[PDB]
Ligand binder design. Sequence first.
Ligand SMILES: *[C@@H]1O[C@H](CO)[C@@H](O[C@@H]2O[C@H](CO)[C@@H](O[C@@H]3O[C@H](CO[C@H]4O[C@H](CO)[C@@H](O)[C@H](O)[C@@H]4O)[C@@H](O)[C@H](O)[C@@H]3O)[C@H](O)[C@H]2NC(C)=O)[C@H](O)[C@H]1NC(C)=O
Ligand SMILES: *[C@@H]1O[C@H](CO)[C@@H](O[C@@H]2O[C@H](CO)[C@@H](O[C@@H]3O[C@H](CO[C@H]4O[C@H](CO)[C@@H](O)[C@H](O)[C@@H]4O)[C@@H](O)[C@H](O)[C@@H]3O)[C@H](O)[C@H]2NC(C)=O)[C@H](O)[C@H]1NC(C)=O
Ligand SMILES: O=P(O)(O)OC[C@H]1O[C@@H](n2cnc3c2N=CNC[C@H]3O)C[C@@H]1O
Ligand SMILES: O=P(O)(O)OC[C@H]1O[C@@H](n2cnc3c2N=CNC[C@H]3O)C[C@@H]1O
Ligand SMILES: *[C@@H]1O[C@H](CO)[C@@H](O)[C@H](O)[C@H]1NC(C)=O
Ligand SMILES: *[C@@H]1O[C@H](CO)[C@@H](O)[C@H](O)[C@H]1NC(C)=O
Ligand SMILES: *[C@@H]1O[C@H](CO)[C@@H](O)[C@H](O)[C@H]1NC(C)=O
Ligand SMILES: *[C@@H]1O[C@H](CO)[C@@H](O)[C@H](O)[C@H]1NC(C)=O
Ligand SMILES: *[C@@H]1O[C@H](CO)[C@@H](O)[C@H](O)[C@H]1NC(C)=O
Ligand SMILES: *[C@@H]1O[C@H](CO)[C@@H](O)[C@H](O)[C@H]1NC(C)=O
Ligand SMILES: [Zn+2]
Ligand SMILES: [Zn+2]
Lengths: 494, 494
Amino acid sequence: LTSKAAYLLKRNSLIEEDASRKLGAKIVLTNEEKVLDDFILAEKRKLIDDSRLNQTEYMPAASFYRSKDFIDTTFAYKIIQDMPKGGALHLHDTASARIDWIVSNATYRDHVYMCMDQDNFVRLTVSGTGPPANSGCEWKLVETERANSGDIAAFDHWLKSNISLLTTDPLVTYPSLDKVWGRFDKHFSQLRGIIYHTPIRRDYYRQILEEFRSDNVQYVEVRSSLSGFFELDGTVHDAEFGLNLYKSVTEEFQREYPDFIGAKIILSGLRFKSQEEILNEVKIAMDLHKKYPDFFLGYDLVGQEDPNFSLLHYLDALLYPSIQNPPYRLPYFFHAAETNWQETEVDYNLADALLLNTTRVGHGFALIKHPRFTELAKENGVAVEVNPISNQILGLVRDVRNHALVPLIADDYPIVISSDDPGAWEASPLSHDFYVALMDLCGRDTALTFLKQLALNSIRYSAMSDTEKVAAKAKWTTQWDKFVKTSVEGLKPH
Amino acid sequence: LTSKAAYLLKRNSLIEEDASRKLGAKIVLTNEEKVLDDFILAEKRKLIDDSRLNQTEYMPAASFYRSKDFIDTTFAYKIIQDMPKGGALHLHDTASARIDWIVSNATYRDHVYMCMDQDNFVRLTVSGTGPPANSGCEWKLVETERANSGDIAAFDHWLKSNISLLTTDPLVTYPSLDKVWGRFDKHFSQLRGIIYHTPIRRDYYRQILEEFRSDNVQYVEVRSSLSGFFELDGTVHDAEFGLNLYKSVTEEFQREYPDFIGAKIILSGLRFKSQEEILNEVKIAMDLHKKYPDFFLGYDLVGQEDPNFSLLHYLDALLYPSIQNPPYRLPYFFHAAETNWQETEVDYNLADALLLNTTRVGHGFALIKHPRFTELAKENGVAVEVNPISNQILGLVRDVRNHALVPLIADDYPIVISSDDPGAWEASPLSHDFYVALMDLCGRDTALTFLKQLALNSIRYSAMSDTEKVAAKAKWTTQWDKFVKTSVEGLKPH
Ligand SMILES: *[C@@H]1O[C@H](CO)[C@@H](O[C@@H]2O[C@H](CO)[C@@H](O[C@@H]3O[C@H](CO[C@H]4O[C@H](CO)[C@@H](O)[C@H](O)[C@@H]4O)[C@@H](O)[C@H](O)[C@@H]3O)[C@H](O)[C@H]2NC(C)=O)[C@H](O)[C@H]1NC(C)=O
Ligand SMILES: *[C@@H]1O[C@H](CO)[C@@H](O[C@@H]2O[C@H](CO)[C@@H](O[C@@H]3O[C@H](CO[C@H]4O[C@H](CO)[C@@H](O)[C@H](O)[C@@H]4O)[C@@H](O)[C@H](O)[C@@H]3O)[C@H](O)[C@H]2NC(C)=O)[C@H](O)[C@H]1NC(C)=O
Ligand SMILES: O=P(O)(O)OC[C@H]1O[C@@H](n2cnc3c2N=CNC[C@H]3O)C[C@@H]1O
Ligand SMILES: O=P(O)(O)OC[C@H]1O[C@@H](n2cnc3c2N=CNC[C@H]3O)C[C@@H]1O
Ligand SMILES: *[C@@H]1O[C@H](CO)[C@@H](O)[C@H](O)[C@H]1NC(C)=O
Ligand SMILES: *[C@@H]1O[C@H](CO)[C@@H](O)[C@H](O)[C@H]1NC(C)=O
Ligand SMILES: *[C@@H]1O[C@H](CO)[C@@H](O)[C@H](O)[C@H]1NC(C)=O
Ligand SMILES: *[C@@H]1O[C@H](CO)[C@@H](O)[C@H](O)[C@H]1NC(C)=O
Ligand SMILES: *[C@@H]1O[C@H](CO)[C@@H](O)[C@H](O)[C@H]1NC(C)=O
Ligand SMILES: *[C@@H]1O[C@H](CO)[C@@H](O)[C@H](O)[C@H]1NC(C)=O
Ligand SMILES: [Zn+2]
Ligand SMILES: [Zn+2]
């Protein structure tokens, strides 16, 4: 043995020790799985080596506006499309389906009005008793404008363009945190008036289920405000009504597609409402969790985190369930530390989130900056929902390889991958975020064990009961074996 | 007590446990030091809270081209200028002094020629025996063109402008890794011909000591190729000549300024040379370390890391000292993992860097992505040299708050702060990098304990002997006490 050879053995041991601690390093692959892993690794290495050695841009790490088409022209992305990714655990209902369906289906119904608002954005609303009661905008019947356009396709494309966040590059058109959050909030107010109409809302939820199933996702946990669904006559429904609407649509979908696992609902409130309102919503969530223990999961506070209220500001509301006699455990799913800041109100939300026994943490972008918080969350088994494309578009990081959670992936932290609002910025339900995770959030030697671990984590860290987890894993295993067999036989020689 | 009061006690305990683990958390401040700490924290909190709550840009995290003037108009920057920061441990000699001195002093000497190359960049060289022998460029004598300008200040300002990296915003003008590294290499090649002329090189090194002393830095460790210094007659000197030139200038400076601590030299070679040449340089470094054991520190490899050779490619050279009989310990100061890549050749340099017993690691941007490497290096006491402004300008991260080493700082990792090439992009010797470290690399509750720990680390992790470290800390303690007492008397009422 040479002194050089002893050095090489020590280097091999050290590199093996470091690489054995990443997410999915304990996954064992079959020979067919290894066929798929080599297929994926080959294209990933081609891209990395071309970018590094030829000193050219690494497209998977660029802005989603610029890389989306490139991603759609790769073989690995088709592989990821076909892969059963398990469950999407972090979704917002009003942005989880295509704008395309809102344009081609919803704005063709009667009593749908459009207008151009003070900021030169299109607003859509439904009014059954004549034009909308807000005359500050000049409301037109959508059918009349579509007819007078002379080109229905051009009209529909302009409508989709005036609603989407991906019509231009957000990193160029809205190049600050404030500007992109302005565009994002404007999107939600553009669709508020039409997407809360009960028939449209029900059909939209069905569209969510269909699109996620067709993208080979079998389970979704959705955040929803759940109340305010309205009728043509002005009747406005409560949170229990929305919950049951979703529940029956879900049960119908399940009977129609036995391969599907299901869907569950988390109630969401807004980070800028009064404490009285948030306490009301917490009591409502208590009643909903009591009465629908198997469909309703818990409560969350959403909206932009930097300029709005902290969790500590709502402590009296969030502590209300626990001060009962006997105490009530209302599960929480807090968004926390979606921020670049350090030792401020926003990232110290993490402290509150762990002390309130949160089931999962959304984003957790500043978690890596808090060693004790990271240890405590790992000890408690608190998984982090990661939405890479979301974090890029909403101004947390430019290069996805700079994502704050990459080190935590490399040290086997419990995480899941999701798309926050895929419909708002035209991403596939889960395939685009999985491709970005594969290309940016792990290294040159990691392809399939990582993705398979993500799929497994989305079941293990779901809010399902243990019986439900066992059944869900069985359904997902059936699909995964089907996918492996089909992809290998389409790729390997006979 | 109350469920709310018990919650608040547990929250306080958890938050202070998290915060007690950061760099400098064990620093005890005197009352005067606390005056300065409150002064700095007040401005820092004003900026952070203004940016967060008024939803405006956080200037300290913007591109250095845009924030430098803003920094120069802050009170905290004056405090940081006056603070004795200890030692600058990571510098490159040809970019450690102002371009202004090259323009106003070096290009006023005889036999200095200028030309415009094919990419419209000015090249400066010295030729004593007639115009330069390269006919690919059309060389003009600098004195005549300066005379024909008619506005000497305008000519000299254009000359500095054609050389600096901060004349335009690098993040805009060279918006990729390849583009900015092309500009950086071009900068060094612009000055190659004039800065290796022996009289100019000696005076330039003297200027380095003067500028770093005036920025209240008492100790510098400089990386240098040390060879190739030439005379007007064509004579080219070896590495020992450069070493002794530097040594005599340093000793003269020390005699003239007893408050100064001193300077030491690390030999640097380029990451794209043959294994044979790098082995020669290792032999030269071995001889220099044997013969000048207190002025010469060791060896390093420099140049852009992504497209050039790995440390493993040079293993035979780098292992040569240890296979001697008896084995020779040649200290190493490797640049390592200055990269966004993961599980590639570039970041696995860290493994080799650690197995070669490196004293410190330059940049180490990918270290956090390797949990075992981070543990091993922390155990071995291997400090990481952090150069925030350099890492922003050379394309590793855009928002300084996303810098990969912020978490390691938050967990008390041994690190030092330096400026890589402060002269190339018009930064102060060390104050600007300290300001950025204060404003971006630590949280809202950290000002002075962090800076004081950085200063102490630059002595603890210097390559000085133990006796030298004791003397250096005494000298620095004198300066620090003077600085504190003077600043407090200038800020507090009588
Ligand atoms: C988050 O989760 C926490 C951990 O589950 C929750 O704290 C738990 O809250 C329950 C219900 O309020 C408490 O259970 C009660 O405990 C006491 C007896 O406990 C101790 O009593 C003495 C004092 O040390 C000691 O002699 C005993 O051996 C016990 O150690 C009784 O009053 C009740 O019968 C009841 O069982 C738990 O004590 C408490 N656990 C912890 C670890 O604090 C917390 O409420 C959750 N927070 C939120 C916001 O949901
Ligand atoms: C980086 O630093 C490392 C630690 O300082 C260096 O490794 C050291 O290398 C030296 C020189 O080759 C070794 O010293 C020799 O050691 C052996 C005896 O060592 C062991 O022998 C048996 C084997 O297990 C065991 O029973 C003994 O107890 C000893 O532990 C003898 O041949 C000589 O007397 C001589 O002292 C060190 O042992 C070795 N240290 C370690 C921890 O491995 C390394 O070479 C440096 N690398 C570079 C590139 O500079
Ligand atoms: O109309 P709704 O109340 O059903 O939803 C609309 C509201 O959702 C919020 N939201 C949706 N995706 C997210 C949200 N907030 C915080 N972090 C990022 C992301 O996770 C904001 C919007 O105003
Ligand atoms: O040898 P010279 O002094 O004539 O040229 C100086 C040479 O140093 C290298 N360098 C200078 N600053 C750095 C360098 N390398 C890599 N990381 C970033 C930074 O730390 C490249 C240059 O060509
Ligand atoms: C770099 O580009 C050339 C084409 O000019 C190609 O042959 C080569 O494979 C590329 N390098 C890598 C590592 O892909
Ligand atoms: C929209 O979809 C529903 C089913 O959800 C369908 O019945 C209806 O015909 C569609 N509407 C339009 C206008 O295409
Ligand atoms: C929306 O449409 C108006 C009118 O056509 C146009 O001027 C404007 O730029 C569009 N806005 C967006 C955000 O696409
Ligand atoms: C926001 O700006 C106003 C000036 O319009 C200033 O008075 C206020 O203090 C700022 N907010 C913060 C938190 O500094
Ligand atoms: C250098 O000067 C020329 C004109 O004198 C100008 O066109 C060129 O852009 C300048 N280059 C830089 C890098 O400043
Ligand atoms: C340049 O500076 C050196 C000392 O650093 C000094 O001796 C010399 O006179 C200066 N040269 C010019 C041309 O000003
Ligand atoms: Zn979300
Ligand atoms: Zn350097």
